[PDB]
Design a protein around this nucleic acid. Structure first.
Ligand SMILES: [Mg+2]
Ligand SMILES: [Mg+2]
Ligand SMILES: [Mg+2]
Ligand SMILES: [Mg+2]
Ligand SMILES: [Mg+2]
Ligand SMILES: [Mg+2]
Ligand SMILES: [Mg+2]
Ligand SMILES: [Mg+2]
Ligand SMILES: [Mg+2]
Ligand SMILES: [Mg+2]
Ligand SMILES: [Mg+2]
Ligand SMILES: [Mg+2]
Ligand SMILES: [Mg+2]
Ligand SMILES: [Mg+2]
Ligand SMILES: [Mg+2]
Ligand SMILES: [Mg+2]
Ligand SMILES: [Mg+2]
Ligand SMILES: [Mg+2]
Ligand SMILES: [Mg+2]
Ligand SMILES: [Mg+2]
Ligand SMILES: [Mg+2]
Ligand SMILES: [Mg+2]
Ligand SMILES: [Mg+2]
Ligand SMILES: [Mg+2]
Ligand SMILES: [Mg+2]
Ligand SMILES: [Mg+2]
Ligand SMILES: [Mg+2]
Ligand SMILES: [Mg+2]
Ligand SMILES: [Mg+2]
Ligand SMILES: [Mg+2]
Ligand SMILES: [Mg+2]
Ligand SMILES: [Zn+2]
Lengths: 232, 155, 54, 60
RNA sequence: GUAGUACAUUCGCAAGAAUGAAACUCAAACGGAAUUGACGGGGACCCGCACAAGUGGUGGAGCAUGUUGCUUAAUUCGACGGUACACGAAAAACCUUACCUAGACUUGACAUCCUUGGCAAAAUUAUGGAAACAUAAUGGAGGUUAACCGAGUGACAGGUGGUGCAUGGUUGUCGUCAGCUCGUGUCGUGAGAUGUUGGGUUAAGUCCCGCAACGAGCGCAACCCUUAUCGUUAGUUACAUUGUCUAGCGAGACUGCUAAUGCAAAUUGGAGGAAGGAAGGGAUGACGUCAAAUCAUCAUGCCCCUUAUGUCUAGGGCUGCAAACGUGCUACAAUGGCCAAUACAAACAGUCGCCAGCUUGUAAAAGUGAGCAAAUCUGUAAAGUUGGUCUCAGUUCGGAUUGAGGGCUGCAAUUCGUCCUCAUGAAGUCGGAAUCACUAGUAAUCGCGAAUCAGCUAUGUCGCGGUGAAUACGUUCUCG
RNA sequence: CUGCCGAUAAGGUCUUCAAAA
């Protein structure tokens, strides 16, 4: 049957919001809401070879702050800070010159156990004509070796160019979806294949959060260092 | 298919004549969820009973309701064609409840005037074993007596 | 706010969302520069909203 | 016929009563939440990702 | 299969028996055994408003809304047993709008890429105009082109056009039912079996025993929210009849103690306790079925159109009407109609708004006009209590329909807004065969608020409180 | 404890594959 979004079921209890701002009026609540979606989509659609895991947005009456986590930030940084200037101009055109931006790339730790880049890698493999069975298994084994709990991958679509759509799942371990205390990270991606669209869904279990609180604490960014800059 | 017996809510002792049964009939004549209205209607009928019968209203009400109370109950049991009925002894709780339901049902159909006098007349007409509720009790009793043979087989 | 889950049909299946505006009050009697100057370095986390009324 | 209606909605009409509100992410016209400027089926997607601060699931 | 049929022959009084093909046709056969499911008007056991016991309804009448059919220039498209029909649509006069009739446009209303300049687009006033659009005007923020304003320019933009039987995404349903599988091992030539079935206990594949099985995953349960008592912090915009109330943290209920019987889980009773054995409610919905629903939220393979299936505007249409069905509202009444006085809520919402008071008005409302960005100000609570009257009538019931006069929104109310006042007063006196919901603050009923919204016969939807029941003996029948 | 109880147009998907990691 149908299931409630795993990310959406855990918001406001154990998971913080990706955008944290309070608008002035119901007219300014819509502009500030579509614009941040454009920024997030920009980061995700293009600049994909970087493995951007999550982009957070922080806005005040007039000051915009962006916290961008990536696995390989060299591509964003570019050759002696070139590509970086380009993206700043991109961000300024979307929000406006009248405001103040404080974009912040922040390098990420433990990149494997994140459902976003795994789905992106999965989608790239399917688009690259890689056999589906082999592609998921290599991603599954590497993620488990990274030192996490069970992972559930559902890859539904016109499998292998077939005319009848199927779906292949591969769970390997305890994925307690009905439990609220668990840390389940979820992401979904659309692999654009020449024979249509492939939907990949990745459920990852990253332990149990036994410390009550609406997070305010990082998630799989702590193990190695996490810095770099571009801020003020 | 249930295997559980339902609980029972309290009946409450009446607030005037301290005769529980008054609260039950109040709830029976209830319509539109008006507790207030129903009490007024019923209580007014006892006052009319005083003016007419010159006797204690609680005693008259018991003499009417106790006389209306049936003894046998006919439960429908179909096998192949129609239903052969089965007379069974009804419990004491259901005896009072069925009596009250009939009293109210024939009271809201009399040719009389405001339901105060309507309901007042039915109870006074039932204390002398000559009314509409009596006939209903008579009919079911005679039907059970006629269908005495199948009483042994119930299910 | 109540929103229908389904895209096309089945109005009956409709989920719900909430947004709570938690509120607090705090009235200061006398402040003076000694407090006001220290009030400049507070840095209130974005989420909290101030209604300073003087 | 979607793109032309979206552009026309942004453009000011010649009568005040000629102005209607259409979702700002997609182009859906009916069932638009003025409190958020987002239609019912984009508000679900946005709410399930955490983009709107404070919109949590309800238990009542 | 023809077919134990036809011909010939022997026996028989007779029916018939014995013997017994072929032409033609099929790729298999009412082939054999065994396995997993489904099904049985086959058994055994167990569940749910299923039946039973009650309550109030529906099917009869008027009205609102949706659908079928018919018509029309169009009556846009989709949903079609349960799982469509107050559904998409949480607002069709214009707009929406996707439809029809017309008047206009062509790298186009919107976009990128390229050679190239920016010394504008708006808005508004004129004339022609149904308005699109043209000819003339103030030539316009700015920042030297940033964004856009353009020229040139071909790739192209554009499609609510088709295919949900190509899909992604999302959802209904069995069903919050208790199931669905895997690893290793064992049995079987094999599909496959085992575990998952036996005995007890539950709402539960929940747990404990037994056991060629040993373990594991998803589901179940708990962790989350809310209501019920108390402690602590805080005391204004609450309270101020002094400890309510509001919201942060915490305590509390754990079969924790006892009695019974069971190996053990566990069941029942009692104690204390605000709360007792999932304390009430919500979120939470396994593998999968029905090629279930959506290309018309969005995205997308493929096909189709490209001075037209694309674009702008005015008018009409989505509101029709011999009919039928579904979901609701109003009633057919003295448990009531009308009039007067009057007590008691919770939740939510509010600066193009809530609108107090005052003045005018038979009234909808208008003018004046404070207060409130809100525990402060505003959004009249009604049923209910008392008094008067009606006296059972097609009525002082019932309000439909119709005529006239007004008020509000809006360019604009005829197609097609609603409110008030006056006038009229259809049907209908409890509704056939047959059906629906509900196990306590529940059914029934009375008001209040919000969403989309300039306005809207939303009587719809999502919420909040006031009053507040009846019944459950039982699984013989009924549905799953 | 033996009432009654009849029917359901044609043809159709769906396993691509282990070479292996
Ligand atoms: Mg579209
Ligand atoms: Mg032979
Ligand atoms: Mg044969
Ligand atoms: Mg079989
Ligand atoms: Mg019944
Ligand atoms: Mg009807
Ligand atoms: Mg009729
Ligand atoms: Mg239609
Ligand atoms: Mg269809
Ligand atoms: Mg259906
Ligand atoms: Mg129109
Ligand atoms: Mg200039
Ligand atoms: Mg220049
Ligand atoms: Mg298309
Ligand atoms: Mg389908
Ligand atoms: Mg066994
Ligand atoms: Mg066992
Ligand atoms: Mg649960
Ligand atoms: Mg189909
Ligand atoms: Mg029109
Ligand atoms: Mg309509
Ligand atoms: Mg209703
Ligand atoms: Mg009266
Ligand atoms: Mg006050
Ligand atoms: Mg008549
Ligand atoms: Mg009337
Ligand atoms: Mg009119
Ligand atoms: Mg009558
Ligand atoms: Mg129940
Ligand atoms: Mg009613
Ligand atoms: Mg029969
Ligand atoms: Zn939208």
């Amino acid at each position: 049957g149908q299931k409630v979004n795993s990310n959406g079921l855990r918001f406001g209890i154990n998971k913080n919001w990706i955008s944290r701002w309070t608008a002035n009026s119901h007219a300014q609540t819509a502009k500030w809401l579509i614009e941040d979606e454009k920024i997030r989509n920009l980061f995700f659609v293009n600049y994909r070879n970087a493995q951007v895991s999550n982009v957070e947005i922080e806005r005040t009456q007039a000051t915009v702050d962006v916290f961008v986590y990536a696995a390989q930030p060299a591509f964003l940084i570019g050759s002696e800070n070139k590509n970086i200037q380009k993206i700043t101009k991109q961000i300024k055109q979307i929000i406006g010159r009248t405001t103040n931006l404080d974009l912040t790339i922040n390098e990420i730790g433990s990149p494997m156990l994140s459902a976003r880049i795994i789905a992106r890698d999965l989608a790239n493999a399917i688009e690259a004509r890689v056999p589906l069975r082999t592609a998921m298994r290599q991603s599954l084994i590497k993620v488990l070796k990274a030192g996490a709990n069970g992972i559930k991958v559902l890859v539904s679509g016109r499998l292998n160019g077939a005319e009848i759509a199927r779906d292949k799942m591969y769970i390997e371990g305890n994925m307690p979806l009905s439990t609220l205390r668990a840390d389940i990270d979820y992401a979904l991606e659309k692999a654009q294949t020449t024979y249509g669209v492939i939907g990949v869904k990745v459920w990852i279990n990253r332990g149990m959060i036994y410390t009550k609180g609406l997070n305010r604490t990082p998630a799989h960014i702590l193990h190695p260092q996490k810095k770099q800059p571009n801020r003020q | 298919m249930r295997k559980n017996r339902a609980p029972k809510r309290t009946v409450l002792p009446d607030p005037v004549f301290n005769n529980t049964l008054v609260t039950r009939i109040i709830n029976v004549i209830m319509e539109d969820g008006k507790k207030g209205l129903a009490q007024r209607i019923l209580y007014g009928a006892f006052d009319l009973i005083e003016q007419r019968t010159k006797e204690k209203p609680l005693t008259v009400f018991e003499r009417a309701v106790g006389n209306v109370m049936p003894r046998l109950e006919l439960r429908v049991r179909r096998i192949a064609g129609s239903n052969y009925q089965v007379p069974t002894e009804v419990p004491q709780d259901r005896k009072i409840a069925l009596a009250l339901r009939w009293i109210a049902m024939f009271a809201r159909k009399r040719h009389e005037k405001t339901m105060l006098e309507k309901i007042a007349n039915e109870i006074i007409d039932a204390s002398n074993n000559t009314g509409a509720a009596i006939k209903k009790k008579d009919d079911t009793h005679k039907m059970a007596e006629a269908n005495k043979a199948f009483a042994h087989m119930r299910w | 706010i109540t929103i229908i889950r389904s895209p096309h049909v089945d109005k009956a299946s409709r989920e719900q969302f909430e947004k709570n505006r938690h509120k607090r009050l705090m009235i200061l009697v006398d402040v003076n520069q000694g407090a006001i100057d220290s009030l400049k370095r507070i840095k209130i986390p974005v989420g909290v909203t101030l209604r300073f009324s003087k | 016929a979607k793109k032309s209606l979206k552009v026309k909605q942004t453009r000011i009409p010649k009568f005040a009563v000629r102005a209607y509100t259409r979702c700002q992410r997609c182009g859906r016209a009916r069932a638009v939440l003025s409190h958020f400027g987002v239609c019912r089926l984009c508000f679900r997607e946005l709410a399930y990702a955490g983009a709107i601060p404070g919109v949590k699931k309800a238990s009542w």
